[PDB]
């Protein structure tokens, strides 16, 4: 759950770091203010993105041997399907009884 | 007639999730469960000089389940790169009958231990996680135990390679091996 | 390039509907079965999670689309089907048209596949049960319509439909097969290595001569559905007989019946009292009969 | 085929691509050379080397961005449903469906109870009335 958001934020930060490095290079090579701080921030963000990528790659490696988490609660799915079918059949029978009663009265 | 291929497993006490989730996910079962029981080893060997262990493991959390006892010992030197286990022979018991028969025939309680943990299974294999305590009868070494064990007839040691592959599957977490 | 990448990322993060790459995939996996990643996807609704079935698994849908899931055909029922049951005018001629009469995309595209795989398992089990059935009744075997005959005036035709009484026993048979699957998986609180069933080892302490040794397991499959249909037609006939006797004996003391709420699988319970017209103190004869399935009341 | 080794190779390739992109950026920043060092042929060779370095830096930046995006996509792919140790989603789905079917069973039971009460009240008037 949180690892997905972490990887998404890491990718967004890598993109932002690339953009900041490009902008800092442009501002520094245009003419010769904040170019030094911009380059420092860009280098720091690039290093942080690299560290985050290395940490995510150095994960616990849950299985890496076969198809893990086999069985997605299919029994519960089938039970819920049968319950819904029972409810639908009950509704149909109740509607039939109601039509019979309306024809009676 | 029957045999066993019990393998020893020892994981750090803190490494619990990497074991429970991996075993619940890789291949164990659906709807896992837990257990609780205490063992009572015994020995009655006067002149034979061969104390036979009779583990009368009674599940305290069970509704009068039989005291399923097992005899294990004398590991056969098969050298088949397996768990290096020996033949096994289970034996059920009745309510308080294990202690009754141990007193009748005459036995000596070598020690008493209790176990508690989660349960797992396989096709022709069985892995169990539990923690042993050191306390009086009314109620630890800080080290869990992965009880990857196989009990089956002799056959042709076909399950040895399967158990080795299953252990290699859980290699990043633990590393099973034999014992002396 | 940086602005293009940032705009693409902001668009993918804003509208979480076209995010097919791993996003709809995470949603699907949280809503569907496992995916053995050989190339892209695998592990369809083969019901191998319960185990003890016939090998029909395989990848079903891994592709990009445009809310952009694949829902590709499976490996290839791809149709709506269901079991059908009916009892009307048994005939030897067979081979007719099995007419079938019928909000994400993957759900509707794969639920039909799961259902037809379940019907295939149903028919395979019914075949394996009818090939070795007992000599209690005949059992005609055709490609799809296995008509049978437990006793006269009750001719069931349990046919398998496809896109290439009538409802209750259907659900009952489906639940019976899924109960079989679940039983083929029981935790005995084991310590050393029993790895069996509780009642199986319970014969040790409580030594039963021949009661539990035979009650630990029994036959099932087609016999259970046959017994259920027999009970159904028997209850229908008993109710019709009571109603006819009521409609006939008008001037006679009108019969007064009363059903029960607890109608079990095989047996049931029916109550009835004479209760002559306008006299509650004359209830000198009131009987309660149970109409079992494989026998009489 | 060697899933762990394949993941390790992918991680090594991503790290090497990131390091190469960083080195290319550092080289493009350090190879400015504002001093007019081109003395043999200034107007030709200086402009040639400038355009070549600009094209090389742009290509390196684009390749690094593409490699980082592909590495992030592959990491999200493998962590999404390939080998995520988080199997609690199955338990949450189990609990949700079990609550749903329990509510359905309770509703059906209440419905059958009311229907049985009404059926008995109706039988009492039907069977005891004929003329």
Quickly list DSSP for chain C: -HHHHHHHHHHHHH-TTS-TTTHHHHHHHHHS-----SSS----S--TTT---------------------PPP----S---EE---S---S------------SHHHHHHHHHHHHHHHHHHHHHHHHHTT--TTS-B---SSEEEB-SBTTB--EEEEP----TTHHHHHHHHHHHHHHHHT------SSS--S-HHHHTTTTS--SSSHHHHT----SHHHHHHHHHHHHHHHHHHHHHHHHHHH-SSS---EEEE-S---SS---EEEE---TT-STT---EEEE---SSS--
* B17, B25, B120, B171, best to mutate vs chain D, most D CBs in 10 Å: B25
**Cα D112 from Cα D11, distance rounded (Å):** 61
Minimal CA–CA distance to A72: which of B103, C14, D91? D91
Residue with structure tokens 């002799």? B154
Subunits adjacent to chain B (3 or more Cβ pairs under 8 Å): A, C, D
Start-to-end C-alpha separation, chain C: 85
D97: closest CA of chain B, how far (Å): 15
The two tokens of residue B161 are: 């390679």
Give SS3 for C257: strand
Strand ranges (E), C82-200: 83-84, 145-147, 157-160
Question: Does residue B21 contact residue B172 with C-beta atoms inside 8 Å?
Answer: no
- Comparing alpha-carbon positions, the chain C residue that sits nearest to A88 is C167
Instruction: In whole angstroms, give the CA distance from residue A22 to residue D25.
Output: 9
Q: Do A68 and B30 touch (CB under 8 A)?
A: no
Question: Can you read off the two tokens belonging to residue B55?
Answer: 């583990």
Q: How many CA atoms lie within 13 A of C82 on its CB side?
A: 14
Q: Residue C273: helix, strand or coil by DSSP?
A: strand
**Other CB atoms within 10 A of residue D89 CB:** 18
Residue A41 has phi, psi (to 5 degrees) of -65, -40
Chain position carrying tokens 């009404």: D118
Q: How far is CA A101 from CA A96, C240, C257, D119, in A?
A: 9, 21, 22, 13
- Closest C-alpha to D127, from C247, A77, B35: C247
Q: Quick check: A70 and C45 CB within 8 A?
A: no
**Interacting residues of B162 by C-beta distance below 8 A, sequence separation 6+:** B124, B125
Angle at A74 (CA atoms; ends A69, A78), nearest 5 degrees: 170
What distance lies between CA C108 and its chain's CA centroid? 20
Contacts of C221 (CB under 8 A, 6+ apart): C125, C126, C128, C129
Which residues in D46-78 are b (16+ Cβ under 10 Å) and which e?
A: beeeeeeeeeebeebbeebbebbbebbebbbbb
Question: What angle, 0 to 180 degrees and rounded to 10, lies between the N-to-C axes of helices A2-30 and D3-30?
Answer: 20
Burial environment of residue C287 by CB neighbours within 10 A (0 to 12, 13 to 18, 19 or more): exposed
Residues of B with Cβ-Cβ distance to C188 under 8 angstroms: 65
Q: Are strands B151-153 and B2-4 parallel, antiparallel or unpaired?
A: antiparallel
Of B30, B68, B93, the CB nearest to C192: B68
Cβ–Cβ pairs < 8 A, chains A and C = 57
- Report the residue of chain B nearest A64, measured CA to CA: B169
CB atoms inside a 10 Å sphere around CB A75: 19
- Asked if A48 and A13 touch (Cβ cutoff 8 Å), the reply is yes
Name the packing angle between helices C23-31 and D88-126 (round to 10°).
50
CB contact D82 to C (< 8 Å): yes
Task: Give me Rg for the CA atoms of chain B.
Answer: 17
**Nearest-CA distance D61 → chain A (Å):** 8
- Distance, in Å, from the CA atom of C64 to the CA atom of C18, rounded to the nearest integer, reads 10
Final resolution, Å: 4.0
Taking the C-alpha atoms of residue C47 and residue C55, their distance in angstroms, rounded to an integer, is: 10
Coil/strand/helix, residue D125? helix
Among candidate residues C257, C256, C253, the one with its CA nearest the CA of residue C269 = C257
Nearest partner of C266 among C222, C221, C235, judged by Cα: C235
**B91: three-class secondary structure by DSSP:** strand
Q: Tell me if B70 sits within 8 A of C179, measured CB to CB.
A: no
Radius of gyration of chain D (CA): 37
Tell whether B116 lies on the interface with C, counting CB pairs under 8 A.
Answer: no
Sheet holding B108-119, edge to edge: B10-12, B143-146, B129-133, B108-119, B33-43
Alpha-carbon separation of residue B111 from A22, B42, B55, B147 (angstroms): 72, 8, 10, 20
Of B22, B27, B171, Cβ closest to residue A62: B22
C-alpha distances in Å from residue C177, one per residue of A75, B20, C166, C183, C272: 12, 31, 18, 10, 36
Mark yes or no for CB contact A75/C174 under 8 Å. no
Tell me what percent of chain A is helix, strand and coil, each rounded to the nearest 5.
80, 0, 20
CA of B94 to nearest chain D CA: how many angstroms apart?
37
Instruction: Provide the β-strand partners of residue C111.
Output: none
Q: How far apart are the first and last CA of chain A?
A: 59
Q: In angstroms, rounded to a whole number, what is the distance separating the alpha carbons of residues C223 and C217?
A: 15
Nearest Cα residue to C173 out of D113, D102, D98, A85: A85
- What is the dihedral sign for C-alpha C78, C82, C83, C85? negative
- Please say whether the beta carbons of C192 and B57 come within 8 A: yes
Which of B45, B36, B67, B51 minimizes the C-alpha distance to B133? B36
Q: Does C279 contact D at CB distance below 8 Å? A: no
Residues 45-84 of B with CB under 8 A from C: 55, 57, 59, 61-62, 65-66, 68-70
Give dist(CA C222, CA A9) in Å, integer.
Answer: 58
Residues of A in contact with D71 (CB under 8 A): 53
d(CA A75, CA A82): 11
Give residues with Cβ within 8 angstroms of B29, minimum separation 6.
B120, B121, B122, C185
> Checking DSSP bridges between strand B143-146 and strand B89-91, what pairing results, if any?
unpaired
Please, is C100 exposed, middle or buried when counting C-beta atoms within 10 Å of its C-beta (0-12, 13-18, 19+)? middle
Q: Say if residues D43 and A23 touch (Cβ distance below 8 Å).
A: no
Other Cβ atoms closer than 10 A to D104: 19
- Nearest Cα to B57, choosing from B44, B45, B42? B42
**Which tokens is D98 given?**
């079990």
Minimum CA–CA partner of B168 in chain A: A65
CB-based contact, C282 to chain A, within 8 Å: no
Chains with 3 or more CB pairs closer than 8 angstroms to D?
Answer: A, B, C
Which pair of structure tokens corresponds to residue C237? Answer: 């006939």
Interface of B with D (CB under 8 A): 17-18, 21-22, 24-25, 172
- The whole-angstrom separation of Cα C266 and Cα C270 is 14
Q: Do B66 and C191 touch (CB under 8 A)?
A: no
Instruction: Determine the Cα–Cα distance for residues D99 and D107; give it in Å rounded to an integer.
Output: 12
Spatial CA neighbour of A78 closest among B115, C45, C41: C45
CA distance B159 to C195: 16
Residue C121 burial by CB count (10 A; 0-12/13-18/19+): exposed, middle or buried?
A: buried
Q: Taking the mean position of all CA atoms in its chain, how far away is CA A60?
A: 19
A12 sits in which H/E element: helix A2-30
Q: Assess contact for C28 and C106: CB atoms under 8 A.
A: yes
Six-digit token string for B101: 């028969």
Name the DSSP class of B149: B
Does B87 reach chain C within 8 Å, measured CB to CB? Answer: no
Query: Per DSSP, what are the bridge partners of residue B40?
Result: B112
> Of C199, C197, C174, which Cα lies nearest the Cα of C186?
C197
Q: How far is CA B25 from CA A62, B3, C101, C259, in A?
A: 9, 28, 40, 50
Q: Which of B4, B30, B151 sits opposite C185 (nearest CB)?
A: B30
H-helix or E-strand spanning residue B145: strand B143-146
**B21 to chain A: which residues are within 8 Å by CB?**
62
D32 touches chain B (CB under 8 A): no
Q: Tell me if A7 and D79 make a contact (CB, 8 A cut-off).
A: yes
Whether the CB-CB separation of D116 and B53 falls below 8 Å is answered with no
Between helices C168-183 and C106-130, what is the axis angle to 10°? Answer: 80
The Cα–Cα gap between D100 and D109 comes to: 14
| Nearest chain B residue to C204, by CA | B92
Tell me which DSSP letter residue B57 carries.
-
Task: Report yes or no: C216 and C199 within 8 Å, Cβ to Cβ.
Answer: yes
- Which DSSP symbol is given to D82? I
Spell out a b/e string for D24-40, using b for 16 or more CB atoms within 10 Å of the CB, else e.
bbeebeeeeeeeeebee
Distance separating alpha carbons of residues A58 and A51, to the nearest angstrom:
10
Task: Measure the N-to-C terminal CA separation of chain B; round to a whole number of Å.
Answer: 23
Whether the Cβ atoms of residue B18 and residue B157 lie closer than 8 Å to each other:
no
**What length is written for chain A?**
105
Largest CA distance in chain A: 97
Q: Which residues of C, range 151-170, sit inside 8 Å of A by Cβ?
A: 167-168
Residues in chain D closer than 8 A to C37 (CB atoms): 82
Q: Which of B31, C167, A87 lies closest to D103, judged by CA?
A: A87
Question: A10 contacts in D (CB within 8 Å)?
Answer: 72
How close D40 comes to chain C (CA, Å)?
36
Cα(D129)–Cα(B66) distance, integer angstroms: 62
Q: Cα separation of D22 and A43, whole Å? A: 9
DSSP B177: B
Bridge partners (DSSP) listed for residue C257: C272
Whole-angstrom distance, CA of residue D51 vs CA of residue D68:
26
Taking the C-alpha atoms of residue C58 and residue C272, their distance in angstroms, rounded to an integer, is 57
Residue of C nearest to D130 (CA): C250
C147: exposed, middle or buried (C-beta count within 10 Å: 0-12, 13-18, 19+)? buried
Q: Does A87 touch chain D (CB under 8 A)?
A: yes
Q: How was this structure determined?
A: cryo-EM
d(CA A70, CA B163): 19
Chain mean position to CA C12: 44
CA distances from B41 to B72, B108, B133, B145, C188 (A): 11, 8, 15, 19, 22
- 8 Å CB contact between C151 and C195: no
- How many C-beta atoms lie closer than 10 Å to residue C230's C-beta? 20
CB contact under 8 A, D87 and B25: yes
How big is chain D, counted in residues?
131
Q: Which residue does chain D place closest to C30, by CA atoms?
A: D89
Q: How far is CA B106 from CA A93, B67, B95, in A?
A: 70, 18, 18
Distance, in Å, from the CA atom of D62 to the CA atom of D17, rounded to the nearest integer, reads: 12
* C-alpha angle A47-A49-A53 in degrees, rounded to nearest 5: 115
SS3 state of residue C289: strand
């Amino acid at each position: 759950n949180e690892r997905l958001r972490a990887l998404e934020d890491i990718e967004r930060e890598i993109g932002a770091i690339l953009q900041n490095a490009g902008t800092a290079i442009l501002e520094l090579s245009k003419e010769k203010r904040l170019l030094d701080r911009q380059a420092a921030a860009f280098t720091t963000s690039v290093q942080h993105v690299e560290a985050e990528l290395s940490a995510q790659i150095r994960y616990l490696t849950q299985v890496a041997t076969g198809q893990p988490h086999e069985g997605s609660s299919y029994s519960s799915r089938k039970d819920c399907q049968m319950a819904l079918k029972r409810v639908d059949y009950a509704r149909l029978k109740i509607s039939d009884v109601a039509r019979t009663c309306e024809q009676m009265l | 007639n029957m045999m066993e291929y019990l393998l020893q497993g020892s994981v750090l006490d803190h490494s619990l999730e990497s074991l429970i989730h991996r075993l619940r996910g890789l291949c164990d079962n659906m709807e896992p469960e837990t257990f609780l029981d205490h063992e009572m080893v015994f020995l009655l060997k006067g002149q034979q000089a061969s104390p036979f262990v009779l583990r009368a493991r009674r599940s305290m959390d069970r509704a009068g389940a039989p005291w399923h006892l097992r005899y294990l010992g004398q590991p056969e030197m098969g050298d088949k790169n397996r768990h290096a286990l020996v033949r096994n022979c289970v034996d059920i018991a009745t309510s308080e009958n294990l202690t009754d028969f141990l007193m009748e025939m005459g036995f000596r309680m070598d020690h008493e231990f209790v176990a508690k943990g989660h349960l797992f299974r396989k096709g022709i294999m069985k892995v169990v996680v539990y923690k042993i305590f050191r306390i009086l009868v009314p109620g630890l070494s800080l080290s869990y135990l992965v009880e990857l064990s196989v009990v089956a007839p002799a056959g042709q040691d076909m399950v040895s390679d399967d158990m080795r592959n299953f252990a290699e599957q859980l290699k990043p977490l633990v590393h099973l091996e034999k014992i002396d | 390039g940086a602005e293009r990448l940032t705009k693409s990322v902001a668009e993918n993060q804003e509208n979480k509907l076209q995010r097919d790459f791993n996003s709809e995939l995470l949603r699907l996996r949280q809503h569907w079965k496992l995916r053995k990643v050989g190339d892209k996807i695998l592990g369809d609704l083969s019901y191998r999670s319960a185990g003890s079935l016939f090998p029909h698994h395989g990848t079903f849908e891994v592709i990009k689309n445009t809310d952009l899931d694949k829902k590709i055909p499976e490996d290839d029922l791809e149709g709506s089907a269901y079991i059908k049951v009916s009892i009307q005018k048994q005939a030897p001629d067979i081979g007719d048209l099995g007419t079938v009469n019928l909000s994400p995309h993957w759900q509707t595209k794969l639920e039909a596949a799961q259902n037809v795989l379940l019907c295939k398992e149903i028919f395979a089990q019914l075949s394996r049960e009818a090939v070795q059935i007992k000599s209690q009744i005949p059992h005609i075997v055709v490609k799809n319509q296995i008509i049978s005959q437990p006793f006269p005036s009750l001719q069931l035709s349990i046919s398998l439909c496809h896109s290439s009484d009538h409802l209750y026993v259907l659900e009952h048979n489906l639940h019976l097969l899924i109960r079989e699957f679940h039983k083929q998986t029981v935790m005995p609180h084991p310590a050393s290595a029993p790895f069996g069933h509780k009642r199986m080892r319970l014969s040790g302490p409580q030594a039963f001569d021949k009661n539990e040794i035979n009650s630990i397991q029994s036959t099932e499959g087609l016999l259970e559905k046959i017994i259920k249909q027999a009970k159904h037609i028997f209850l229908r006939s008993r109710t019709a007989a009571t109603i006819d006797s009521l409609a006939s004996r008008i001037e006679d003391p009108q019969i007064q019946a009363h059903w029960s709420n607890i109608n079990d699988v095989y047996e049931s319970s029916v109550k009835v009292l004479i209760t002559s017209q306008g006299y509650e103190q004359i209830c000198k004869s009131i009987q309660l009969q149970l109409n079992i399935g494989v026998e009489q009341v | 085929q060697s899933k762990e080794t394949l993941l390790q190779s992918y991680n090594k390739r991503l790290k090497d691509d990131i390091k190469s992109i960083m080195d290319n950026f550092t080289e493009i920043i350090k190879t400015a050379k504002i001093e007019d060092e081109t003395q043999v042929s200034r107007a030709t060779q200086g402009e040639q080397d400038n355009y070549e370095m600009h094209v090389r830096a742009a290509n390196i930046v684009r390749a690094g961005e593409s490699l980082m995006k592909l590495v992030s996509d592959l990491k999200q792919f493998l962590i999404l449903n390939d080998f995520p140790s988080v199997n609690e989603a199955i338990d949450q789905r189990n609990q949700q469906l079990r609550a749903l079917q329990e509510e359905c069973d309770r509703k059906l039971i209440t419905l059958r109870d009311e229907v049985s009460i009404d059926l008995y009240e109706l039988e009492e008037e039907y069977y005891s009335s004929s003329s």
